[PDB]
Design an enzyme around this catalytic site. Structure first.
Site, PDB file in Angstrom:
ATOM      1  N   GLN A 282      32.728  31.170  28.666  1.00 55.44           N
ATOM      2  CA  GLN A 282      32.491  32.006  29.815  1.00 55.44           C
ATOM      3  C   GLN A 282      33.769  32.582  30.415  1.00 55.44           C
ATOM      4  OE1 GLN A 282      32.683  28.855  33.322  1.00 55.44           O
ATOM      5  NE2 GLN A 282      30.757  28.513  32.273  1.00 55.44           N
TER       6      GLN A 282
ATOM      7  N   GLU B 163      29.779  34.730  33.648  1.00 53.28           N
ATOM      8  CA  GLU B 163      29.248  33.901  34.721  1.00 53.28           C
ATOM      9  C   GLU B 163      29.579  34.598  36.028  1.00 53.28           C
ATOM     10  OE1 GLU B 163      31.167  30.101  35.587  1.00 53.28           O
ATOM     11  OE2 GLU B 163      29.831  29.786  37.201  1.00 53.28           O
TER      12      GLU B 163
ATOM     13  N   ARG C 141      48.340  41.219  41.244  1.00 54.22           N
ATOM     14  CA  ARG C 141      47.681  41.322  39.946  1.00 54.22           C
ATOM     15  C   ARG C 141      47.539  39.950  39.283  1.00 54.22           C
ATOM     16  NH1 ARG C 141      49.116  47.376  40.542  1.00 54.22           N
ATOM     17  NH2 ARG C 141      51.162  46.534  40.978  1.00 54.22           N
TER      18      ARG C 141
ATOM     19  N   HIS D 161      40.670  42.666  33.077  1.00 52.78           N
ATOM     20  CA  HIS D 161      39.358  43.256  32.768  1.00 52.78           C
ATOM     21  C   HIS D 161      38.623  42.365  31.804  1.00 52.78           C
ATOM     22  CE1 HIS D 161      42.426  45.092  30.012  1.00 52.78           C
ATOM     23  NE2 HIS D 161      41.620  44.899  29.034  1.00 52.78           N
TER      24      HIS D 161
ATOM     25  N   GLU E  37      36.560  47.390  29.907  1.00 54.49           N
ATOM     26  CA  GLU E  37      37.076  48.236  28.852  1.00 54.49           C
ATOM     27  C   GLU E  37      35.867  48.518  27.952  1.00 54.49           C
ATOM     28  OE1 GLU E  37      40.764  47.024  27.211  1.00 54.49           O
ATOM     29  OE2 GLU E  37      40.127  47.341  25.092  1.00 54.49           O
TER      30      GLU E  37
HETATM   31  C1  LIG Z   1      44.660  45.403  27.808  1.00 60.80           C
HETATM   32  O1  LIG Z   1      43.660  46.189  27.117  1.00 60.80           O
HETATM   33  C2  LIG Z   1      44.038  47.011  26.084  1.00 60.80           C
HETATM   34  C3  LIG Z   1      45.097  47.928  26.305  1.00 60.80           C
HETATM   35  C4  LIG Z   1      45.602  48.075  27.684  1.00 60.80           C
HETATM   36  C5  LIG Z   1      46.769  48.456  28.233  1.00 60.80           C
HETATM   37  C6  LIG Z   1      46.959  48.836  29.666  1.00 60.80           C
HETATM   38  O2  LIG Z   1      47.978  48.412  30.271  1.00 60.80           O
HETATM   39  C7  LIG Z   1      46.134  49.888  30.379  1.00 60.80           C
HETATM   40  C8  LIG Z   1      45.887  49.753  31.752  1.00 60.80           C
HETATM   41  C9  LIG Z   1      45.174  50.705  32.469  1.00 60.80           C
HETATM   42  C10 LIG Z   1      44.684  51.843  31.842  1.00 60.80           C
HETATM   43  O3  LIG Z   1      43.954  52.786  32.540  1.00 60.80           O
HETATM   44  C11 LIG Z   1      44.927  52.006  30.481  1.00 60.80           C
HETATM   45  C12 LIG Z   1      45.657  51.055  29.773  1.00 60.80           C
HETATM   46  C13 LIG Z   1      45.436  48.769  25.239  1.00 60.80           C
HETATM   47  C14 LIG Z   1      44.820  48.692  24.013  1.00 60.80           C
HETATM   48  C15 LIG Z   1      43.773  47.791  23.826  1.00 60.80           C
HETATM   49  O4  LIG Z   1      43.128  47.702  22.634  1.00 60.80           O
HETATM   50  C16 LIG Z   1      43.317  46.955  24.849  1.00 60.80           C
HETATM   51  O5  LIG Z   1      42.273  46.066  24.572  1.00 60.80           O
HETATM   52  C1  LIG Z   2      31.712  28.611  38.357  1.00 60.77           C
HETATM   53  O1  LIG Z   2      31.802  27.625  37.286  1.00 60.77           O
HETATM   54  C2  LIG Z   2      30.879  26.608  37.260  1.00 60.77           C
HETATM   55  C3  LIG Z   2      30.800  25.750  38.389  1.00 60.77           C
HETATM   56  C4  LIG Z   2      31.658  26.046  39.558  1.00 60.77           C
HETATM   57  C5  LIG Z   2      31.914  25.391  40.701  1.00 60.77           C
HETATM   58  C6  LIG Z   2      32.458  24.026  40.905  1.00 60.77           C
HETATM   59  O2  LIG Z   2      31.696  23.093  41.195  1.00 60.77           O
HETATM   60  C7  LIG Z   2      33.894  23.837  41.328  1.00 60.77           C
HETATM   61  C8  LIG Z   2      34.279  22.507  41.521  1.00 60.77           C
HETATM   62  C9  LIG Z   2      35.559  22.182  41.932  1.00 60.77           C
HETATM   63  C10 LIG Z   2      36.484  23.183  42.178  1.00 60.77           C
HETATM   64  O3  LIG Z   2      37.698  22.708  42.576  1.00 60.77           O
HETATM   65  C11 LIG Z   2      36.124  24.522  42.025  1.00 60.77           C
HETATM   66  C12 LIG Z   2      34.833  24.839  41.632  1.00 60.77           C
HETATM   67  C13 LIG Z   2      29.772  24.796  38.365  1.00 60.77           C
HETATM   68  C14 LIG Z   2      28.978  24.552  37.263  1.00 60.77           C
HETATM   69  C15 LIG Z   2      29.136  25.340  36.125  1.00 60.77           C
HETATM   70  O4  LIG Z   2      28.328  25.176  35.034  1.00 60.77           O
HETATM   71  C16 LIG Z   2      30.099  26.358  36.088  1.00 60.77           C
HETATM   72  O5  LIG Z   2      30.221  27.041  34.887  1.00 60.77           O
HETATM   73 ZN    ZN Z   3      32.234  28.336  35.361  1.00 58.58          ZN
HETATM   74 ZN    ZN Z   4      41.871  45.017  26.840  1.00 58.44          ZN
END
Ligand code: A1L5R
Ligand code: A1L5R
Ligand code: ZN
Ligand code: ZN
Lengths: 176, 175
Positions: free
Chosen positions: B27, B93, B116, B120, B166
């Protein structure tokens, strides 16, 4: 009270035939130090580096990580990219050249204001044995498996402080 | 820096320890302001399926698990359903904290402006241009249309919280 089950379902539509082969291919996280990140994700979590891209004009690199057999990575460059970027469930780690030496710089993990992104999550056959290994390797924990009220579920943090959930699908049928 | 050589990169990589051999990237968690808009966009616009929902009446939140799965593979029985759902790879999720959907001063941050981190998610598709023509018709907001800017043939759309998605075609990537 949030949505009932039925209400939530009514908000969903069945998928259009045009979306039939879409897949959820990547989640991208910026990383300060690619050295530390590659070590963590391959040595600690057992992912494989499947693709590396450099862009010298924009000064960044991309690292694609995945739970894939490195024997399956193809040898030719063009076919390699196509296979890597057609894999489900990759992690794309972006490195902006220079961040690793900049003592002021750090990325935000989304878990404090301003929040949005929360975590990625790894399904493991056994949270206790995974987390015991993690402990032995010096990994930093946000929430040990037995800490808090959600027993059997843990969070760790990568070198950038991004949270990673560690979960056992076969046990999660024990709270709502 | 000039960033890492390929060799210096590989040298920081270890082979997968056998204790990790059945691990899977299960996830990516995003917080959503309003699950009604989010469910509509990710099913009707992107074609995902809702495979599991979980509610936490004390902590006042719900989790919605979304994935590219055939709805007919979803188990009918609840306990089995969870095991199946939380063992699928490549789910999204969505966490709803109750009440956010009514709060006019509340919004999530998409990671792409200070400060930042997360950037994405990304969907591989067979045809970026056709997909994006359909997105436009359906009113989807774009960060980058396929021919905008330098990287031709790749897009970014936004979901209803403004998270960047993306849209890429693996066989066209690499110019
Ligand atoms: C990080 O994701 C990527 C990048 C991404 C590179 C970037 O920094 C980016 C950010 C904003 C925008 O509007 C365009 C590009 C380039 C190629 C690729 O395959 C991919 O998955
Ligand atoms: C959001 O992710 C989850 C959670 C997410 C929430 C949590 O219980 C959590 C516990 C402690 C902490 O310090 C921060 C968050 C709970 C069950 C589950 O299956 C899952 O994937
Ligand atoms: Zn989770
Ligand atoms: Zn990417």
């Amino acid at each position: 009270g949030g949505l009932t089950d039925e209400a939530a379902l009514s908000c969903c539509s069945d998928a259009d035939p045009s979306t039939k082969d879409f897949l959820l291919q990547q989640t991208m996280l910026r990383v300060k130090d690619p050295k530390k990140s590659l070590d963590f994700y391959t040595r600690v979590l057992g992912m494989t580096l499947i693709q590396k891209c450099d862009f010298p004009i924009m000064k960044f690199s991309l690292y694609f990580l995945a739970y894939e057999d490195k024997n399956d990575i193809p040898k030719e460059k063009d076919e390699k990219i196509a296979w890597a970027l057609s894999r489900k469930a990759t992690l794309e780690l972006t490195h902006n050249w220079g961040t690793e030496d900049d003592e002021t710089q750090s990325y935000h993990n989304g878990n404090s204001d301003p929040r949005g992104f929360g975590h990625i999550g790894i399904a493991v056959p056994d949270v206790y044995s995974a987390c015991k290994r993690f402990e032995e390797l010096g990994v930093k924990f946000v929430k040990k498996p037995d800490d808090g009220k959600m027993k059997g579920l843990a969070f760790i943090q990568d070198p950038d402080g991004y949270w990673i959930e560690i979960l056992n699908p076969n046990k999660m049928a024990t709270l709502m």
